[PDB]
Design a protein around this ligand. Structure first.
Ligand SMILES: [Mg+2]
Ligand SMILES: [Mg+2]
Ligand SMILES: [Mg+2]
Ligand SMILES: [Mg+2]
Ligand SMILES: [Mg+2]
Ligand SMILES: [Mg+2]
Ligand SMILES: [Mg+2]
Ligand SMILES: [Mg+2]
Ligand SMILES: [Mg+2]
Ligand SMILES: [Mg+2]
Ligand SMILES: [Mg+2]
Ligand SMILES: [Mg+2]
Ligand SMILES: [Mg+2]
Ligand SMILES: [Mg+2]
Ligand SMILES: [Mg+2]
Ligand SMILES: [Mg+2]
Ligand SMILES: [Mg+2]
Ligand SMILES: [Mg+2]
Ligand SMILES: [Mg+2]
Ligand SMILES: [Mg+2]
Ligand SMILES: [Mg+2]
Ligand SMILES: [Mg+2]
Ligand SMILES: [Mg+2]
Ligand SMILES: [Mg+2]
Ligand SMILES: [Mg+2]
Ligand SMILES: [Mg+2]
Ligand SMILES: [Mg+2]
Ligand SMILES: [Mg+2]
Ligand SMILES: [Mg+2]
Ligand SMILES: [Mg+2]
Ligand SMILES: [Mg+2]
Ligand SMILES: [Mg+2]
Ligand SMILES: [Mg+2]
Ligand SMILES: [Mg+2]
Ligand SMILES: [Mg+2]
Ligand SMILES: [Mg+2]
Ligand SMILES: [Mg+2]
Ligand SMILES: [Mg+2]
Ligand SMILES: [Mg+2]
Ligand SMILES: [Mg+2]
Ligand SMILES: [Mg+2]
Ligand SMILES: [Mg+2]
Ligand SMILES: [Mg+2]
Ligand SMILES: [Mg+2]
Ligand SMILES: [Mg+2]
Ligand SMILES: [Mg+2]
Ligand SMILES: [Mg+2]
Ligand SMILES: [Mg+2]
Ligand SMILES: [Mg+2]
Ligand SMILES: [Mg+2]
Ligand SMILES: [Mg+2]
Ligand SMILES: [Mg+2]
Ligand SMILES: [Mg+2]
Ligand SMILES: [Mg+2]
Ligand SMILES: [Mg+2]
Ligand SMILES: [Mg+2]
Ligand SMILES: [Mg+2]
Ligand SMILES: [Mg+2]
Ligand SMILES: [Mg+2]
Ligand SMILES: [Mg+2]
Ligand SMILES: [Mg+2]
Ligand SMILES: [Mg+2]
Ligand SMILES: [Mg+2]
Ligand SMILES: [Mg+2]
Ligand SMILES: [Mg+2]
Ligand SMILES: [Mg+2]
Ligand SMILES: [Mg+2]
Ligand SMILES: [Mg+2]
Ligand SMILES: [Mg+2]
Ligand SMILES: [Mg+2]
Ligand SMILES: [Mg+2]
Ligand SMILES: [Mg+2]
Ligand SMILES: [Mg+2]
Ligand SMILES: [Mg+2]
Ligand SMILES: [Mg+2]
Ligand SMILES: [Mg+2]
Ligand SMILES: [Mg+2]
Ligand SMILES: [Mg+2]
Ligand SMILES: [Mg+2]
Ligand SMILES: [Mg+2]
Ligand SMILES: [Mg+2]
Ligand SMILES: [Mg+2]
Ligand SMILES: [Mg+2]
Ligand SMILES: [Mg+2]
Ligand SMILES: [Mg+2]
Ligand SMILES: [Mg+2]
Ligand SMILES: [Mg+2]
Ligand SMILES: [Mg+2]
Ligand SMILES: [Mg+2]
Ligand SMILES: [Mg+2]
Ligand SMILES: [Mg+2]
Ligand SMILES: [Mg+2]
Ligand SMILES: [Mg+2]
Ligand SMILES: [Mg+2]
Ligand SMILES: [Mg+2]
Ligand SMILES: [Mg+2]
Ligand SMILES: [Mg+2]
Ligand SMILES: [Mg+2]
Ligand SMILES: [Mg+2]
Ligand SMILES: [Mg+2]
Ligand SMILES: [Mg+2]
Ligand SMILES: [Mg+2]
Ligand SMILES: [Mg+2]
Ligand SMILES: [Mg+2]
Ligand SMILES: [Mg+2]
Ligand SMILES: [Mg+2]
Ligand SMILES: [Mg+2]
Ligand SMILES: [Mg+2]
Ligand SMILES: [Mg+2]
Ligand SMILES: [Mg+2]
Ligand SMILES: [Mg+2]
Ligand SMILES: [Mg+2]
Ligand SMILES: [Mg+2]
Ligand SMILES: [Mg+2]
Ligand SMILES: [Mg+2]
Ligand SMILES: [Mg+2]
Ligand SMILES: [Mg+2]
Ligand SMILES: [Mg+2]
Ligand SMILES: [Mg+2]
Ligand SMILES: [Mg+2]
Ligand SMILES: [Mg+2]
Ligand SMILES: [Mg+2]
Ligand SMILES: [Mg+2]
Ligand SMILES: [Mg+2]
Ligand SMILES: [Mg+2]
Ligand SMILES: [Mg+2]
Ligand SMILES: [Mg+2]
Ligand SMILES: [Mg+2]
Ligand SMILES: [Mg+2]
Ligand SMILES: [Mg+2]
Ligand SMILES: [Mg+2]
Ligand SMILES: [Mg+2]
Ligand SMILES: [Mg+2]
Ligand SMILES: [Mg+2]
Ligand SMILES: [Mg+2]
Ligand SMILES: [Mg+2]
Ligand SMILES: [Mg+2]
Ligand SMILES: [Mg+2]
Ligand SMILES: [Mg+2]
Ligand SMILES: [Mg+2]
Ligand SMILES: [Mg+2]
Ligand SMILES: [Mg+2]
Ligand SMILES: [Mg+2]
Ligand SMILES: [Mg+2]
Ligand SMILES: [Mg+2]
Ligand SMILES: [Mg+2]
Ligand SMILES: [Mg+2]
Ligand SMILES: [Mg+2]
Ligand SMILES: [Mg+2]
Ligand SMILES: [Mg+2]
Ligand SMILES: [Mg+2]
Ligand SMILES: [Mg+2]
Ligand SMILES: [Mg+2]
Ligand SMILES: [Mg+2]
Ligand SMILES: [Mg+2]
Ligand SMILES: [Mg+2]
Ligand SMILES: [Mg+2]
Ligand SMILES: [Mg+2]
Ligand SMILES: [Mg+2]
Ligand SMILES: [Mg+2]
Ligand SMILES: [Mg+2]
Ligand SMILES: [Mg+2]
Ligand SMILES: [Mg+2]
Ligand SMILES: [Mg+2]
Ligand SMILES: [Mg+2]
Ligand SMILES: [Mg+2]
Ligand SMILES: [Mg+2]
Ligand SMILES: [Mg+2]
Ligand SMILES: [Mg+2]
Ligand SMILES: [Mg+2]
Ligand SMILES: [Mg+2]
Ligand SMILES: [Mg+2]
Ligand SMILES: [Mg+2]
Ligand SMILES: [Mg+2]
Ligand SMILES: [Mg+2]
Ligand SMILES: [Mg+2]
Ligand SMILES: [Mg+2]
Ligand SMILES: [Mg+2]
Ligand SMILES: [Mg+2]
Ligand SMILES: [Mg+2]
Ligand SMILES: [Mg+2]
Ligand SMILES: [Mg+2]
Ligand SMILES: [Mg+2]
Ligand SMILES: [Mg+2]
Ligand SMILES: [Mg+2]
Ligand SMILES: [Mg+2]
Ligand SMILES: [Mg+2]
Ligand SMILES: [Mg+2]
Ligand SMILES: [Mg+2]
Ligand SMILES: [Mg+2]
Ligand SMILES: [Mg+2]
Ligand SMILES: [Mg+2]
Ligand SMILES: [Mg+2]
Ligand SMILES: [Mg+2]
Ligand SMILES: [Mg+2]
Ligand SMILES: [Mg+2]
Ligand SMILES: [Mg+2]
Ligand SMILES: [Mg+2]
Ligand SMILES: [Mg+2]
Ligand SMILES: [Mg+2]
Ligand SMILES: [Mg+2]
Ligand SMILES: [Mg+2]
Ligand SMILES: [Mg+2]
Ligand SMILES: [Mg+2]
Ligand SMILES: [Mg+2]
Ligand SMILES: [Mg+2]
Ligand SMILES: [Zn+2]
Lengths: 118, 122, 131, 22, 204, 59
RNA sequence: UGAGGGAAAGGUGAAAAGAACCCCGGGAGGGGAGUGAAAUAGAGCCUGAAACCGUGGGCUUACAAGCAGUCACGGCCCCG
RNA sequence: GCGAAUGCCGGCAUGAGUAACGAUAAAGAGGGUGAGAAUCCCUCUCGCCGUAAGCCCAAGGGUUCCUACGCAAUGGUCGU
RNA sequence: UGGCACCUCGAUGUCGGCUCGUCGCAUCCUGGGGCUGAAGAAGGUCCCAAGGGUUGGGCUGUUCGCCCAUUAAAGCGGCACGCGAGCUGGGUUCAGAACGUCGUGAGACAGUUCGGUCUCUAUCCGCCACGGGCGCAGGAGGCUUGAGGGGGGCUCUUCCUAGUACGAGAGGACCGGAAGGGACGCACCUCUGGUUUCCCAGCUGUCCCUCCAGGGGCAUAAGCUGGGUAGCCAUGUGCGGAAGGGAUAACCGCUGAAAGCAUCUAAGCGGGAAGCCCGCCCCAAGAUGAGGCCUCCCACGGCAGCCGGUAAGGACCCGGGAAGACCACCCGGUGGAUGGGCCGGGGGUGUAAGCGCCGCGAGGCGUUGAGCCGACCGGUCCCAAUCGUCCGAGGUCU
């Protein structure tokens, strides 16, 4: 059973799944759009959003928090200084996931892209 | 939740100090005794020359349990040990005093004798 | 339909508001109606509150006291009609929500770990300066 | 319920494998 | 022999005469009658009740027509109560009065593919003393050459739950007609949000 | 555990019997409203790169 | 380890005349073109059985009980 | 003169698209190359070893070393 | 326990236990009876009865048995002495060792003793679950009848009646009525109580970012510790066994001959079991004997037939779901609250960081119930369910 449980396991233990979510956040805040598997993508959404929405808050605490997942001071800075601001008046929903048409070759994995909004 | 093997403190002055449950007299197959039930039990530790002595097989009623007893008023009460007062075949205490509080259920179960001898009833 | 809202509606006829706020570590006196065949009386029970479970009208708190050398813990529904009043006998300063640890502590020891919640005490005095 | 104790007819398995053949 | 559709909303307990009363809360009315079954026409007797309103944009034409004929706005769910003919053309919780006793059907929570232990309270295996990978296994299922086969209905692991369960003789503790609420004492199949049926009880 | 094994060879008829459910269903595919090329629905069109009216991909 | 044990594996065509060139393909392979009496003799090559695997057609089959056939009648399809 | 010798040799079935794909140290993204990329190169990130899972001798192997060009087959997938 | 030696020695694994049971009835209990050396209560003995029930522990490999504490009762047997492709492996078949005994000896024993390899993959039938296909003479969307099945079926204590009947007395009812249990079943999660792999906090070593402050990884597949929401859960909670109708068993009878009397029977009619039928709960029209009701579509093109476009509908695809291995079921798909984010509440945790103050310091106090904050109850189109494709009747004959 699984009745009413939010979150995937993505065939990773606890420690790894977190890592996974971070070094995607990092890749996505860096490049603004990445491609993964559709499920990992779907989960990336919320993870990033919160960090984005925190940068939006802008305060020191907010940085230090965001910095716990992202680690990179330069990055956080591009997050706060260049990223947060385009969403001042956006109320949640700072990411979008769009499904790609082709499956990967080696394993036939369904791919999607995740990107930051405008 | 007293069940056979369970050791319980005796809270009277019979002289027995620790007794071990050996039956729950409550049906042909009760899994557990709670407050106000009677167990048969052997005595595993007594003090010298009480009325009761090591190895005696006696009856006792349960007066404290470490597992909480729920009450129709939605409340519950729970004690720090499980206790019994050794009794005679007409549910009278064989002891002359009982020490510690006892659960109020003992009254509804007609052990008023032990209840009054008790210093506090919760 | 808002199911949660609906439950609250039903619970609403039964919610109290006349009882004092208190926290884990506070020492408290609960005056509880009690039946005894035949008088139904009020038996106070005074101890430290070691837990408060919060779930709305269903929050319940737990009180530990020592009684003639045996420890007692008793669980009351925060909204039980069967509670007459609750008298804060003492504010205590815990550092955690659930205080089960005082179960294995010497009456000295508890006293060290649960010092008088000086802030919330002075605060109590602040009210009762009543106009 | 038989009294005359019923000896086993068979040895409890087992010893060794004819590995390999090639 | 009255009855009514409704959705399960949840549990709390109330206090009544210095007692906690576990209750499940059910939103019951209002259920409009949308067909009657008659012995002449149908061969037996019952009301078809509708329940919960539906977006007419979602109501296909065969259905829209059935509703139409019964002069009734679209409903999410249709279910019959058997041998019940209400005077009115709408059944509401008013038909139950606190202190009545009722039966409740609903659909139990699915447990999916359940093992023999969760399903049937089998005793499983030892967990030590030598037990080799059988700790929740069913044990033996059979005899030998006679009868050389397995019984129909041999208890086994399979799907479990998400079935019709009717729980009987529960006490109506209160009814709140201003809100279409039914407070039945104790517990009812299905998840909060499940659809349930409340019938006047058969146990007497 | 005692090494279960098939008691008889499975007929040509009986394997193929089993295999009655092995047929693939062809990809479900729609026309891309922009370049009229066929594609999985709900995917970004890989021919023109449009989705929901707009360009989303260089391709 | 060693003494020692100890296989499988023959055949284009008369003649390489062993398929230039084009076409699809990364290639493999193939389609044309060419050679040849013959190329399902095209080199993975005489002949090319059988088991085994396919594709296309005819008859048949989802209320039936079976060493799978045999005898009878009927239906459909083929050859007159 | 074969149908049986748990016969001999060989070929092809069944089991079955089933078990498995060899340590639960672990991955993610971007860029490149390419007909083709989860699997090759490069960058960032994350994990694992660190009396080792790093380094040096010796046996034993015997070119496996370094470059260029390749991907039929070997590589438990893929493969540039 | 034996006799026999018939399948099986190109293998039918064998004691006991565990697990799962199912059946017999020569019934242990519980229901119903006759007789009694049956006053009562209790009990003897026999008859009817297999629906349900039939406990926990000491000894020993043990089955068996003895014993302790109970109990309504602690039934006996069959199923390869049921069940090793289900587990065990204590015991009895091997190899080692020893004792007693026997043998000069090697060794031996229906003696004793310690030790001693139990085999991932289910083809078929059978079983538990779930689909796919086709069918149910037009195609569709709903709602149902229930043939036939399956489930369930236990029992105690106390009190009232009544210290009455009965009995010197001790003891002590029938009938009728009330309450409270044991075990078991189905559900549930309000409470109690678990868990809750990252929801919060503390803590040590270490490497790091960025020196401090603050943080990160690793110490497990949570480093450790204290707590812990939903969910899934029992020790927790609700409810179940029936009632009731009918036909019967043994048994008791009414009327009544053959047989002027008698007779429960030959004619006929009563009463009578926990058992039987129904009733309760669940499954169920592949019930091919393929049922019924309500609503929707309709006479479309060319030659009980085929082809093509539609009709009502349907599927595909997508967002999901206390539904679920896949499948299936259910909800939603911008005419939208489906999931994601954001917002509010809940709930956990238990007073963040920063800064000001006090202390030499470790710290402490205040800002501050602060900060963080999964799933729960809601709001809100910010993000994504864009756009679409394909199926699908034209109704056989008397
Ligand atoms: Mg489920
Ligand atoms: Mg699980
Ligand atoms: Mg969810
Ligand atoms: Mg997670
Ligand atoms: Mg999930
Ligand atoms: Mg992985
Ligand atoms: Mg995997
Ligand atoms: Mg983990
Ligand atoms: Mg870890
Ligand atoms: Mg999309
Ligand atoms: Mg796709
Ligand atoms: Mg590949
Ligand atoms: Mg002694
Ligand atoms: Mg709620
Ligand atoms: Mg409301
Ligand atoms: Mg008092
Ligand atoms: Mg329903
Ligand atoms: Mg199981
Ligand atoms: Mg169960
Ligand atoms: Mg269980
Ligand atoms: Mg067990
Ligand atoms: Mg177990
Ligand atoms: Mg064990
Ligand atoms: Mg073993
Ligand atoms: Mg194990
Ligand atoms: Mg048979
Ligand atoms: Mg199901
Ligand atoms: Mg009320
Ligand atoms: Mg629920
Ligand atoms: Mg097996
Ligand atoms: Mg094994
Ligand atoms: Mg084997
Ligand atoms: Mg095998
Ligand atoms: Mg076989
Ligand atoms: Mg074959
Ligand atoms: Mg074939
Ligand atoms: Mg087959
Ligand atoms: Mg040799
Ligand atoms: Mg030649
Ligand atoms: Mg030649
Ligand atoms: Mg020639
Ligand atoms: Mg060429
Ligand atoms: Mg080319
Ligand atoms: Mg290339
Ligand atoms: Mg070529
Ligand atoms: Mg070609
Ligand atoms: Mg060619
Ligand atoms: Mg020519
Ligand atoms: Mg010629
Ligand atoms: Mg030829
Ligand atoms: Mg030739
Ligand atoms: Mg040839
Ligand atoms: Mg020749
Ligand atoms: Mg050939
Ligand atoms: Mg064919
Ligand atoms: Mg038939
Ligand atoms: Mg037929
Ligand atoms: Mg013929
Ligand atoms: Mg022969
Ligand atoms: Mg063989
Ligand atoms: Mg062979
Ligand atoms: Mg053979
Ligand atoms: Mg051979
Ligand atoms: Mg041969
Ligand atoms: Mg051979
Ligand atoms: Mg061979
Ligand atoms: Mg094969
Ligand atoms: Mg498969
Ligand atoms: Mg298989
Ligand atoms: Mg498998
Ligand atoms: Mg292997
Ligand atoms: Mg596998
Ligand atoms: Mg591996
Ligand atoms: Mg491991
Ligand atoms: Mg790339
Ligand atoms: Mg690659
Ligand atoms: Mg490649
Ligand atoms: Mg790459
Ligand atoms: Mg790899
Ligand atoms: Mg690389
Ligand atoms: Mg790790
Ligand atoms: Mg070191
Ligand atoms: Mg040397
Ligand atoms: Mg060398
Ligand atoms: Mg070599
Ligand atoms: Mg070199
Ligand atoms: Mg080289
Ligand atoms: Mg090299
Ligand atoms: Mg190279
Ligand atoms: Mg290669
Ligand atoms: Mg290649
Ligand atoms: Mg290759
Ligand atoms: Mg080559
Ligand atoms: Mg290879
Ligand atoms: Mg390869
Ligand atoms: Mg390999
Ligand atoms: Mg014999
Ligand atoms: Mg013989
Ligand atoms: Mg013999
Ligand atoms: Mg024989
Ligand atoms: Mg034999
Ligand atoms: Mg054989
Ligand atoms: Mg054989
Ligand atoms: Mg054999
Ligand atoms: Mg066998
Ligand atoms: Mg066997
Ligand atoms: Mg038996
Ligand atoms: Mg039986
Ligand atoms: Mg009998
Ligand atoms: Mg009797
Ligand atoms: Mg008798
Ligand atoms: Mg009598
Ligand atoms: Mg007598
Ligand atoms: Mg007598
Ligand atoms: Mg008799
Ligand atoms: Mg008799
Ligand atoms: Mg029986
Ligand atoms: Mg039986
Ligand atoms: Mg024993
Ligand atoms: Mg012992
Ligand atoms: Mg024994
Ligand atoms: Mg022993
Ligand atoms: Mg012995
Ligand atoms: Mg014995
Ligand atoms: Mg008796
Ligand atoms: Mg016994
Ligand atoms: Mg056997
Ligand atoms: Mg047996
Ligand atoms: Mg046996
Ligand atoms: Mg056996
Ligand atoms: Mg075995
Ligand atoms: Mg055995
Ligand atoms: Mg067996
Ligand atoms: Mg076998
Ligand atoms: Mg088993
Ligand atoms: Mg032994
Ligand atoms: Mg042994
Ligand atoms: Mg030996
Ligand atoms: Mg010895
Ligand atoms: Mg000797
Ligand atoms: Mg001898
Ligand atoms: Mg001698
Ligand atoms: Mg001698
Ligand atoms: Mg011999
Ligand atoms: Mg040993
Ligand atoms: Mg031995
Ligand atoms: Mg085995
Ligand atoms: Mg083993
Ligand atoms: Mg297999
Ligand atoms: Mg199979
Ligand atoms: Mg078979
Ligand atoms: Mg079907
Ligand atoms: Mg189907
Ligand atoms: Mg539907
Ligand atoms: Mg009908
Ligand atoms: Mg029926
Ligand atoms: Mg049938
Ligand atoms: Mg009386
Ligand atoms: Mg009862
Ligand atoms: Mg229970
Ligand atoms: Mg809850
Ligand atoms: Mg709970
Ligand atoms: Mg709770
Ligand atoms: Mg709790
Ligand atoms: Mg965290
Ligand atoms: Mg650290
Ligand atoms: Mg640095
Ligand atoms: Mg520092
Ligand atoms: Mg590290
Ligand atoms: Mg490390
Ligand atoms: Mg690790
Ligand atoms: Mg941690
Ligand atoms: Mg806890
Ligand atoms: Mg913990
Ligand atoms: Mg929880
Ligand atoms: Mg339970
Ligand atoms: Mg009856
Ligand atoms: Mg009758
Ligand atoms: Mg007469
Ligand atoms: Mg006569
Ligand atoms: Mg008669
Ligand atoms: Mg009668
Ligand atoms: Mg009669
Ligand atoms: Mg009578
Ligand atoms: Mg009964
Ligand atoms: Mg049905
Ligand atoms: Mg039904
Ligand atoms: Mg039908
Ligand atoms: Mg039939
Ligand atoms: Mg029908
Ligand atoms: Mg879907
Ligand atoms: Mg799904
Ligand atoms: Mg839909
Ligand atoms: Mg659409
Ligand atoms: Mg939403
Ligand atoms: Mg939302
Ligand atoms: Mg929230
Ligand atoms: Mg809040
Ligand atoms: Mg709160
Ligand atoms: Mg502070
Ligand atoms: Mg602070
Ligand atoms: Mg200073
Ligand atoms: Mg909040
Ligand atoms: Mg969230
Ligand atoms: Mg709106
Ligand atoms: Mg389109
Ligand atoms: Zn396009």
């Amino acid at each position: 059973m699984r009745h009413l449980k939010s979150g995937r396991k993505l065939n990773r233990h606890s420690s790894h799944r977190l890592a996974l979510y971070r070094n995607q956040a990092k890749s996505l805040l860096t490049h603004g759009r990445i491609t993964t598997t559709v499920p990992k993508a779907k989960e990336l959404r919320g993870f990033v959003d919160h960090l984005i929405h925190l940068a939006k808050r802008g305060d020191l605490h907010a940085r230090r928090l965001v910095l716990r997942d992202l680690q990179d001071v330069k990055l956080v800075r591009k997050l706060f200084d260049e990223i947060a601001p385009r969403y001042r008046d956006r109320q949640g929903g700072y990411t979008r996931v769009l499904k790609l048409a082709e499956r990967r070759r080696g394993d036939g994995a369904p791919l999607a892209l995740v990107e930051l909004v405008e | 939740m007293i069940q056979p093997q369970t050791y319980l403190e005796v809270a009277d002055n019979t002289g027995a100090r620790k007794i071990m449950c050996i039956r729950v007299l409550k049906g042909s197959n009760a899994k557990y005794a709670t407050v106000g039930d009677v167990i048969v039990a052997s005595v595993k530790e007594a003090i010298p020359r009480g009325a009761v002595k090591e190895g005696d097989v006696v009856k006792a009623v349960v007066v404290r349990t470490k597992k909480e007893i729920k009450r129709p008023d939605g409340s519950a009460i729970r004690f720090d040990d499980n206790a019994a007062v050794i009794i005679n075949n007409q549910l009278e205490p064989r002891g002359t005093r009982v020490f510690g509080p006892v659960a109020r259920e003992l009254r509804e179960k007609g052990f008023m004798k032990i209840v009054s001898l008790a210093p506090e009833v919760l | 339909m808002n199911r949660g809202a609906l439950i609250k509606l039903v619970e609403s006829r039964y919610v109290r508001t006349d009882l004092p706020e208190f926290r884990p570590g506070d020492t408290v006196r609960v005056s509880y109606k009690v039946k005894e065949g035949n008088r139904t009386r009020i038996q106070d029970f005074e101890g430290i509150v070691i837990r408060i479970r919060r779930n709305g009208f269903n929050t319940t708190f737990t009180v530990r006291k020592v009684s003639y050398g045996v420890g007692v813990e008793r669980i009351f529904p925060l909204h039980s009609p069967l509670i007459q009043k609750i008298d804060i006998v003492q504010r205590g300063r815990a550092r955690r929500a659930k205080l089960y640890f005082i179960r294995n502590l010497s009456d000295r020891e508890i006293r060290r770990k649960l010092r008088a919640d000086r802030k919330r005490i002075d605060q109590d005095r602040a009210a009762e300066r009543a106009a | 319920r038989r009294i005359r104790f019923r000896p086993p007819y068979l040895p409890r398995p087992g010893r060794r494998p004819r590995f390999p053949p090639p | 022999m009255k009855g009514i559709l409704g959705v399960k909303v949840g549990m709390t307990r109330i206090f009544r005469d210095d007692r906690a009363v576990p209750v499940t809360v059910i939103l019951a009315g209002p259920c409009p009658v949308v067909q009657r079954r008659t012995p002449e026409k149908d061969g037996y007797t019952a009301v078809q009740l509708g329940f919960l309103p539906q977006n007419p944009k979602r109501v296909n034409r065969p259905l829209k027509g059935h509703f139409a004929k019964a002069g009734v706005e679209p409903v999410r769910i249709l279910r019959e109560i058997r041998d019940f003919n209400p005077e009115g053309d709408t059944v509401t919780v008013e038909i139950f009065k606190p202190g009545e006793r009722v039966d409740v059907t609903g659909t139990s929570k699915g447990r999916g593919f359940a093992g023999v232990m969760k399903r049937w309270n089998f005793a499983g295996g030892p967990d030590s003393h030598g037990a080799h990978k059988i700790h929740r296994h069913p044990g033996s299922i059979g005899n030998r050459k006679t009868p050389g086969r397995v019984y129909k209905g041999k208890k086994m692991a399979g799907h479990y739950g998400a079935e019709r369960v009717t729980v009987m003789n529960l006490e109506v503790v209160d009814v709140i007609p201003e809100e279409n609420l039914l407070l039945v004492k104790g517990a009812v199949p299905g998840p909060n949000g499940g659809l349930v049926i409340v019938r006047e009880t058969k146990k007497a | 555990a005692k090494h279960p094994v098939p008691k008889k060879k499975t007929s040509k008829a009986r394997r193929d019997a089993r295999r009655s459910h092995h047929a693939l269903t062809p990809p479900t595919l729609v026309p891309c409203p922009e370049c009229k090329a066929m594609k999985p629905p709900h995917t970004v069109c890989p021919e023109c790169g449009y989705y929901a009216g707009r360009k989303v991909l260089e391709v």
